[PDB]
Design a protein around this nucleic acid. Structure first.
Ligand SMILES: [Mg+2]
Ligand SMILES: [Mg+2]
Ligand SMILES: [Mg+2]
Ligand SMILES: [Mg+2]
Ligand SMILES: [Zn+2]
Lengths: 64, 225, 129, 102, 267
RNA sequence: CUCUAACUAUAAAAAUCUCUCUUCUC
């Protein structure tokens, strides 16, 4: 199937990664806005973007 | 991970077509006597399933048998001994605590006292019972430790041992379990040692079982329904 | 009870290749054993949360096909003389098991803890790294 | 010279204690020079509390915790970030690091 | 032209061991032509390249040469393959080389046929390849049988009689292989007269030299007499030499001398 | 002048180095 979902960031949890070029945010789904994940982004983001995720069970883990 | 050096030293089917469900029936000493279901291979004339069920030990939370949640941290093992057809009957096999509660009460700055006793009940059933108690900080103890001297610990162990011997030798595990559910033995043990030491969290954990006389048919059918 | 057919999830999460192994109440009957290394390529991301996620999805699908709708979690670490701390994957395995429709009842930790027995592997000075 | 008047052991009147093994590297180290950390946590993190609560029978389950006392070695304790090097005037203090949260 | 994969499907299967010719490398991984199957590229990930730690990409990749490979995931809508090279066992590479060699021999033979007949290789495979693989399981084994037994081409429709005739010409010219069954007999005779007995045993052994299997007694030293046979079926020469052993023992025992066996008939 | 709560969690490899050292008084 094609379970492409969207998620609007509500807050950005700093920038992580050994490179220092990836960031970590807290995304909340367009549906069921009380259900949120923490996810890693590779690019410039701010409060308001809408990420596209092919997963929903995944949660971000700090990259070292 | 397909990697397999095939160091082997299709005739495939679905094993679930040749299987079915039996029902677990709890002793009448518990309220919610409908425990659950068990998956079993289909009956065969050469190898009857009814032989295969007997000896099974199901492990169920005590609160799942009485509805309440005061018995949340206990756990009871039932033994499958007699199968009535599409429904089987289970006798008591053992009792235990949940590790979560046990680690929750085993805390620092207090001495845990363990009493261990192997006895014979009113019938020929032979049991082993473990009791665990913890010294209690008094409601006025400005001293922050709550340790107990070795003499107090030995006296407490003696009292708990004699109480357990009394309360096992005077009843059967039918009555003994009907007594374990309202944990009146815990209260009796705590009260009998009120003068020696406070003894918070007097509990009876891991009621074991070591022997069974022959089969005990009549009481087994009498214990159900 | 509304006839929630129960099983025990019985997750086993070592520091490598977590296990998800659902059984009936008795435990003598084993169904849907699919593990963490069952579904990953790197031979070492078996302990990774994604491996446990995939294994949990597979067992959920299998047991839902079976008829069991609710499961009992029995988290086990590697136990014994080893670290006996829960593996990284088993947590995600439990989360994915709770995700896929299955109902959850009586989470327990059943790790085997010893009475300081059977001297630990490694020598007196232990693993030097 | 004496870096520690307590010698780090914290024995002072025993001569010998029974050693314990490290949880990471399995170092046979005396039980008092075996810096101990009592990890008490939830069996399900705050990341999955909502998911478990929504998808669990027995409404308002107690959600039991997990308890483990970790017996680290000292090399791992320095390396696995459990314990940190301190100023020689800060080594005096033995109180835990000021109540992580109130 | 070179196309038309040997096996059942142009796209690959699941977990099928594959057989790669690397073309170039990008940053992500290696896109590699697949020679076991028809032409479709596979992606070998960098993290899944080398058994050892990755240190020299070009030392191991060897752009322009062939190697072993294993398929992990497949795409059955447009065509994509995920491949690994780290997870190849020590023994599987041997069966990989033999499968490569036989499939490549078949490919070369049928490409020769197609180039001579100027018909696309796919059509010639339609008339020859997979009905043969259905009959025998391997086109090369069936080719060897057609070298021996010509009933292989029975029940199949070729595009023209010339195709089968020239295929037979090529297979007889190139796929020509007889195993030397050699045995050693020690004549420990000490009797009065053995040269006459040796000659009689010679005649008895050599008279049974059949039209297709000629058994000859070669002489090298006094005790060691070599027995040589060209076994085409490899299951008849041993009986021929056993009969020769019976004959020589019968000749030798009655005269007075003795004979001993040193090397029985073996391939 | 009145209180006992929150929590995690990485260990790839890295050997060696030759000169030559020079005052402080109003
Ligand atoms: Mg080190
Ligand atoms: Mg020093
Ligand atoms: Mg210390
Ligand atoms: Mg002294
Ligand atoms: Zn250590």
């Amino acid at each position: 199937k094609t379970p492409v979902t969207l998620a609007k960031v509500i807050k950005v949890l700093g920038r992580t990664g050994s490179r220092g070029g990836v960031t970590q945010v807290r995304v909340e789904f367009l549906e069921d806005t009380t259900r949120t994940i923490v996810r890693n982004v590779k690019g410039p983001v701010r409060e308001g973007d809408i990420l596209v995720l092919m997963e929903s069970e995944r949660e971000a883990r700090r990259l070292r | 991970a397909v990697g397999k050096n095939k160091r082997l030293s299709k005739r495939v089917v679905d094993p679930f077509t040749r299987k079915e469900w039996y029902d677990i029936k709890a002793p009448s000493t518990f309220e919610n006597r409908n425990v659950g279901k068990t998956l079993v291979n289909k009956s065969v004339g050469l190898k009857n399933a009814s032989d295969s069920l007997k000896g099974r030990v199901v492990e169920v939370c005590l609160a799942d048998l009485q509805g309440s949640e005061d018995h949340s941290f206990r756990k009871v093992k039932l033994r499958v001994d007699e199968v009535q057809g599409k429904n089987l009957l289970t006798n008591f096999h053992g009792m235990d605590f949940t590790t979560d509660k046990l680690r929750s009460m085993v805390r620092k700055w207090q001495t845990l006292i363990e009493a261990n006793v192997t006895v014979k009940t009113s019938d020929d059933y032979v049991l082993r019972i473990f009791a665990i108690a913890f010294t209690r900080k008094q409601a006025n103890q400005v001293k922050r430790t709550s340790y107990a001297q070795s003499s107090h610990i030995r006296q407490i162990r003696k009292v708990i041992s004699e109480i357990l011997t009394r309360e096992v030798q005077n009843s059967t595990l039918a009555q003994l379990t009907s007594k374990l559910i309202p944990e009146v033995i815990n209260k009796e043990i705590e009260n009998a040692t009120k003068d020696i030491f406070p003894l918070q969290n007097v509990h009876i954990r891991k009621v074991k079982l070591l022997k069974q006389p022959k089969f005990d048919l009549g009481s087994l059918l009498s214990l159900h329904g | 009870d509304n006839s929630q057919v129960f099983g025990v999830a019985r997750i086993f999460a070592s520091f490598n290749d977590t296990f998800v192994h659902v059984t009936d109440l008795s435990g003598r009957e084993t169904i849907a054993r699919v593990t963490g290394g069952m579904k990953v390529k790197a031979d070492r991301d078996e302990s990774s949360p994604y491996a446990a996620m995939l294994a949990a999805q597979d067992v959920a699908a299998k047991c839902k096909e079976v008829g069991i709708t609710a499961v009992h979690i029995k988290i086990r670490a590697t136990g014994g003389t080893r670290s006996k701390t829960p593996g990284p994957g088993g947590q995600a395995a439990l989360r994915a098991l709770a995700r896929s429709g299955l109902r959850i009842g009586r989470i327990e930790d059943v790790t085997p803890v010893p009475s300081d027995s059977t001297r630990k592997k490694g020598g007196r000075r232990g693993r030097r790294l | 010279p004496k870096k520690r008047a307590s010698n780090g052991r914290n024995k002072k009147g025993r001569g010998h204690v029974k050693p314990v093994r490290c949880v990471n590297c399995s170092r046979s180290v005396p039980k008092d020079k075996a810096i101990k950390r009592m990890a008490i946590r939830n069996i399900v993190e705050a990341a999955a509390i909502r998911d478990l609560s929504e998808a669990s029978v027995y409404a308002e389950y107690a959600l039991p915790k997990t308890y483990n006392k970790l017996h680290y070695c000292i090399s791992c304790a320095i390396h696995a970030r459990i314990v940190r090097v301190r100023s020689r005037t800060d080594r005096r203090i033995r109180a835990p690091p000021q109540r992580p949260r109130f | 032209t070179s196309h038309c994969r040997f096996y059942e499907n142009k796209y690959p299967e699941i977990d099928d061991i594959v057989m790669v010719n690397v073309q170039q490398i990008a940053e992500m991984g290696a896109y590699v032509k697949l020679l076991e199957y028809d032409n479709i590229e596979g992606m070998i990930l960098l993290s899944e390249l080398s058994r050892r730690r990755i240190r020299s990409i070009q030392k191991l990749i060897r752009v322009g040469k062939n190697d072993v490979a294993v398929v992990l995931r497949v795409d059955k809508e447009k065509g994509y393959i995920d491949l690994s090279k780290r997870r190849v066992s020590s023994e599987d590479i041997i069966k990989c080389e033999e499968k490569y060699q036989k499939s490549k021999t078949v490919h070369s033979i049928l490409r020769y046929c197609a180039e001579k007949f100027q018909i696309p290789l796919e059509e010639l495979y339609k008339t020859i390849a997979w009905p043969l693989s259905r009959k025998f399981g391997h086109a090369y084994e069936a080719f060897k049988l057609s070298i021996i037994d010509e009933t292989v081409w029975e029940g199949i429709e070729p595009p023209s009689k010339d195709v089968l005739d020239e295929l037979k010409n090529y297979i007889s010219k190139r796929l020509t292989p007889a195993v030397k069954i050699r045995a050693d007999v020690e004549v420990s005779c000490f009797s009065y007269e053995g040269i006459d007995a040796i000659k009689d045993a010679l005649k008895s052994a050599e008279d049974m030299s059949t039209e297709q299997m000629q058994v000859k007694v070669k002489l090298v030293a006094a005790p060691l007499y070599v027995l040589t046979t060209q076994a085409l079926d490899k299951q008849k020469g041993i009986e021929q030499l056993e009969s020769a052993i019976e004959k020589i023992t019968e000749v030798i025992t009655k005269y007075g001398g003795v004979c001993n066996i040193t090397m029985p008939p073996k391939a």
